[PDB]
Design a binder for these strands. Structure first.
Length: 101
RNA sequence: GGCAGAGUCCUUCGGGACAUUGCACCUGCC
């Protein structure tokens, strides 16, 4: 395939298991991604489109670049999964730039 | 303030049938 591949603040992971809880999927993303840097927050949805994926916000855009080079296609919930950068930024960073100026 | 969806619809929100390897940061009842 031909993925544009672009750097962003939040990364989107897909191809996950379809039987994870909300406190269990958010606790695993904060333990691995935090090892690289400090995480701000993690959101997980269980809708049809979101039936196996999550989003993590890194303190800086560089913190997500390293989390993808080492976690590119790694095991998360008893299964292999590839990570692709997110398409847009996170709404929490909208005010982190400086109380929305 | 309880609770689910965040996938569609009947709807008194009480319950109920049926689909999805797919870029989200959100609403409603009382």
């Amino acid at each position: 395939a031909v993925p544009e591949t672009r750097p962003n603040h939040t990364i989107y992971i897909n191809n996950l298991n379809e039987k994870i809880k909300k406190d269990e999927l958010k606790k695993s993303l904060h333990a691995i991604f935090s090892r690289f840097g400090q995480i701000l927050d993690i959101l997980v949805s269980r809708s049809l489109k979101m039936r196996g994926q999550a989003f993590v916000i890194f303190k800086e855009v560089s913190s997500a670049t390293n989390a993808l080079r080492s976690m590119q296609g790694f095991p998360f919930y008893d299964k292999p999964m590839r990570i692709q950068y997110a398409k847009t930024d996170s709404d929490i960073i909208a005010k982190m730039k400086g109380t929305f100026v």
